Specification:
Chain lengths: 79, 79, 79, 79, 79, 85, 85, 85, 85, 85
């Protein structure tokens, strides 16, 4: 037997009100807020990569080796 | 046996009100907010990549190796 | 036996009100909001890629290796 | 037997109100806020990588070796 | 038997109100706030990497050797 | 006098505003005004006797949520001789 | 007098504003005004006797949440002779 | 007099503002005004007797949350002869 | 007189502001105004007798949270002859 | 007179401000104004007798949290003849 990332809840009663709940979060992006007010941005690009926005990436994988969740704003010239 | 990312809930009663609930979240992007007010953006691009918007990516995979969830704003010139 | 990303809920009673619920979320994008007010955008592009909008991608796959969920705003010139 | 990252809760009563709950968070990005007001940004790029935005990456993997969660703003010229 | 990162809670009563809860956090980034007001940034880049934004990365892995959670703003020219 | 000009350009934007007043805006926000959440009551053997003569009585398990803009919110009001001239 | 100019450019933006007043804005925020959360009561054998004559009485398990803008929020008010001229 | 100019450039921005007044803004924030959270009461054998004549009485398990802007928030008010001229 | 200029550049920004007044802003902050949290009461055998004549009485387990801007917050007020001219 | 200039540059920023007044800002901060936290009371056999005539009485387990801006916060006020001219 093997348990990994398991949320367990048990409750027992005879008379009254009983509440049982279980929650699980794996690879979750929650609550991203961005505000830009009266912002000046001047970009001159020649063959490059420029990133100025908002990026939110959430990845969950099982039995995955070598995976990349995010790769933002890069120049790759492998030979 | 093997349990991975399992949410379990059990409840028992005789008289009254009983509530049982279970929730699971895997690779979930939740709550992304962006505001731009009176923002000036001037972009000149010659053969490059420029990203200024909002990107939200959520990926869930099983038995997947080498997967890329997001690749935003890049220049690739592999030989 | 093998359990992965399983939400389980069980309830038992004799008299009264009983509520049982189970929810599962895998590769889900939820709640993306964007506002642009009085925003000036000037873009000059010559052979490149420019992205300024809103992108929301959700991907769920099983037994998929090398999959890419999102690839936004890139220049590819592989040889 | 083996337990890893397991949240367990148990409750028992006879009469009254009983509440049982369990929560689990693995690889979760929560609560990212950014504000830019009256900000001036001038960028000149020639074959490089410039990143000025907001990046939020959350990755959860099982049996994954060599995985990279985030790789932002880099130049790679491997031979 | 082996327990690692396990949150356990148990409660027992006869009459009254009983509350049982368990929480677990592994590889979680919480509460990142950044404010830039009237900030001037001038960047000239020629073949390099410049990073000025906000980066929040959270990674949780099991049986993963050699994994890199974040690699921001670097130049790699391995031979 | 407010003047905005743009001459001899390739892409030009010229905006002029005399007076401007911004407003209220919500983006991905949650609000709760006058909200009752999660009330649980258990009673086994309760004896209640009420003798009310010309008054307001509130008895039992009561869960009241009120949201008022230009009025009054009351639960029990035993008044008299209310006049507006 | 407010003047903004931009001449002999490739990309030019010229904005002029006389008077500006910003507003209220919420981005990914949560608010709670007058919220009752998580009330649990257990009673076994309670005896209650109420004799009310011309008054306001609040009895029992009471959970009240009120949110008022331009009015008064009251639970029990036994008044008299309320006039507005 | 407020003047902003930009001449002989490739990318040029010129903004001029006479008077500016910023506003209130919330980004990823939580607020709690008048919030009652986590009230638990256990009673076994309680005897209550109330004899009210022309007054306001609050009895029992009471959980009140109030949020008022331009008014008064009261729980028990036994007044009289309220007039506005 | 406020003047801002930028001439003979490749990337140029020129902003001029006469008068500026910043505002209030919250970023990733939490606020608690008038909050009651975590109240637990246990009573076994309590005897209560109340005889109220023309007054305000608050009895029992009471949890009150109030947040007022331009008004008064009271729990028990037994007044009389309230007038505004 | 406030003048800012930038001439013969590659990247140039010129900002001029006559009068500036900063505001209040919170970044990752927590505030608690009028907060009651963690009140536990245990009573076994308590006898209470109250005889109130034209007054304000507060009795029992009381947990009150108040936050007021432009008003008064009172718990028990037995006054009379309140007038404003
Ligand atoms: C709630 C309650 C119960 C029992 C005793 C009382 C005093 C109250 N309070 C109020 O009625 C508050 N009020 N008063 C007035 C003015 C008015 C009232 C009665 C007769 C003539 C004029 C009013 C007018 C227009 C729209 C709303 C309202 C309002 O809401
Ligand atoms: C809540 C309550 C219960 C019992 C006893 C009292 C005194 C109160 N308090 C109030 O009624 C407060 N109030 N007063 C007025 C003015 C007014 C009241 C009555 C008659 C004529 C004029 C009012 C007018 C318009 C909209 C709201 C309101 C308001 O809310
Ligand atoms: C809550 C309560 C219970 C019992 C006894 C009292 C004194 C109070 N307090 C108040 O009514 C406070 N108040 N007063 C006034 C003015 C006014 C009141 C009554 C009659 C005529 C005018 C008012 C007007 C408009 C909107 C709100 C309000 C308000 O809220
Ligand atoms: C809470 C309470 C209970 C019992 C006894 C008292 C004195 C109080 N206190 C107050 O009513 C405070 N107050 N007063 C006034 C002015 C006013 C009051 C009554 C009649 C005519 C005018 C008022 C006007 C407009 C909006 C709010 C308010 C307010 O809040
Ligand atoms: C809380 C309380 C209980 C019982 C006895 C008293 C004296 C108090 N204190 C106050 O009412 C304080 N107060 N006074 C006034 C002025 C005023 C009051 C009554 C009648 C006419 C005018 C007021 C006006 C507008 C908004 C708020 C308020 C306020 O809050």
């Amino acid at each position: 037997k093997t348990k990994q990332g398991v949320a367990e809840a048990a409750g027992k009663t005879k008379e009254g009100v009983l509440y049982v709940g279980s929650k699980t979060k794996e690879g979750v992006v929650h609550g991203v807020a961005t505000v830009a007010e009266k912002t000046k941005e001047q970009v001159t690009n020649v063959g490059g990569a420029v990133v100025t926005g908002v990026t939110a990436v959430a990845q969950k994988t099982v039995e995955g080796a070598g995976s990349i969740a995010a790769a933002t704003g890069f120049v790759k010239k492998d030979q």
